[model samples]
Target: EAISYSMPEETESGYLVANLAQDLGLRVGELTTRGARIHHNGNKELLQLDAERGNLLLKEKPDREALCGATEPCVLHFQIILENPVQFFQTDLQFTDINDHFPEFPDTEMLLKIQEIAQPGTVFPLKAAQDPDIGSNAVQNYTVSPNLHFHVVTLSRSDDRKYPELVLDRALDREEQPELTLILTALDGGAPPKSGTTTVRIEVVDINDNAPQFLQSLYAVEVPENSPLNALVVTVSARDLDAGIHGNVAYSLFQGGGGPQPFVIDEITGEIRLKGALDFEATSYYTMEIVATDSGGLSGKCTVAIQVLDVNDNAPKLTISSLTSSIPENAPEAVVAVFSVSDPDSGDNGRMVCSIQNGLPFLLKPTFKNFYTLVTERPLDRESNAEYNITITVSDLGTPRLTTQHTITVQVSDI
Candidate 1:
């Protein structure tokens, strides 16, 4: 009995067809045809059969790219060498592939712009590299560079395809850095694997993230009651932590102060200056709200207390203690008379000088701050100066002097 033997093509290793005499029921020494040669019916000279071993093999490696397409097949016919007769057989072989081709990306680099204040879970779709080889040799998995603020995540999965996305793992701060750069790699699961690389650049854009802040909640300062106009009263300051246009800050006075603002502020410098008339009697203290706004139109407010300090705003006044209608005719020093004087102003403005128009045994002595004493310095003889009228006056040493006086009458009586 005789039958055709078959051998599958292998590119890496040599193809070993079947042994001729053993499988074909012919004795090994009897199968040889010394003058016979192998013949192939195909147009290409790819087929060659070994005469001594009675084996048929393909001389060249078979490439499926040039041969079979999708669901298509190729045929090769070969004839064995024999002395009296020739035999031809058609063999069906399957062509497969290896990891010979590398993965490639059409795009050199991808660009993405993101807001600095973008929330977590923000997703960005990405396109990966393509591999010409089908099956396991094609694109299989994706990977990204290691970073703290960003990571890659799966967009979705299908039976034959997988899409991926770049997700924001955490929050981003533009103040820290304005841009991000990363490298993405795509790999295939073929033996002697293949990989491709692409660049990704991300720019952090500004957002209205932060409002202006004041170091302190409130500020306190003082200015003289008659302070000149257009003079700086105090500085109000605020700060922002954003960047670029979002970080630019401006200042303005609050309208709540109402009724013709008394203080004006620098829009850029946050400086507060006196703008209107000031009076300690009318307004001893002024409370104002200052607003600090960023270019993003976000704002914050701070409170300021401006105290109008007193000048020589008050004059000294004199008052007398209780007294008997008249002193005893002879004499009596029982510290009978006592009086006090005061000036409401403070500092040098409150300093005072005192004198008597008709001072005699009744003398005035300084007691304490802005106070004096009316004492009997010597023996009193009512008959000598009966019904003495005394005018006591006081004045302060200030820029524009102020004075006050009070009159008193001492009546004498008979014992």
Candidate 2:
């Protein structure tokens, strides 16, 4: 036959687990008459059987947590020996749990450095409270001290023990409240539940919460090609909402889009100036992007458009290519001179015209793009006018009208 008994752990010696004779259906004195005894692998004397009274008594206090740890239904197996008829009986003793240990944290004080920009409903995991006792005697739920920012939630593991997590109820502000100290308590399920407390230190750190914003999206300006170096082109403005170092802004060129950088910006002050001369003849329109960055590395961008204006800064240049000192005097038409003109200006300032003396018996003919040829209007006379002097003039239609002139001489010879 088999029998089982229930007892609480840490029951001192001489406490009765059960009456073996009554559980086995034997008379009170029958165990003594049959010379019965308790046997447990023959190495341990944990329990003693009183044959005269038929009582099973504990020889030592039972520590359930030390014996079985977190194992449930902690039971110890033994056998009863009866010598008269050589009979055997199997017995089991199950030790119930007692709240003998308090919940303990891995550290007495836990430090959590959270960002000020962290949103509400964020969950932060905390170290689980540990208790050697199992079942209802172990950690059950967690609680946090009164505060406006956070609360605590308890979660269960696969083994059914409870752990704690901290949840944010409100957003943090490093500028308002830099740090906080809260008490986290862990409770267990017992007759008078035991609990433990640990310190939860919360430190609010700064974050790049705000990005710089420009006052205007696009800035338009006009700069003359004759503008001197370091001339003021434009000024950009931006502002940030964040406080402390995050609010400080610095200006820089975001993207040059390739080519020479003709502009420079002040980091502290948003001033854009010409780093070099502006040339309308080379590049007329300019587009650039400027960035405003905070100390926290957040940035904003804006575009700058510049138009280079033209000025009468250059005079027309004439290049003489071909000339004849002595053209055939009887020739009806001949090209006496070939030349080209150039003017480094825009619009009307770059438009050019070519001309020669009125009564020189010569005419100007258009060849191609700013090129001209001087041809004789009629056959020249060798008797009356044996020699002729011609002057070619190149001029632009600018307000000031710049001109350049070159002279050529030809002589009539006998043929």
Q: What is the C-alpha lDDT of each candidate?
A: 0.71, 0.86
- Encode model 1's per-residue lDDT on 318-337: one tens digit a residue: 78874665666556553445
**lDDT score for candidate 1 against the true structure:** 0.71
RMSD of each: 8.1, 12.1
Off by over 4 Å in 2: 210-248, 251-293, 296-415
Off by over 4 Å in 1: 1-93, 107-109, 148-150, 154-159, 175-181, 255-261, 295-297, 313-394, 399-415
Superposition TM-score, candidate 2 onto the true structure: 0.55
The top-ranked prediction according to lDDT is: 2
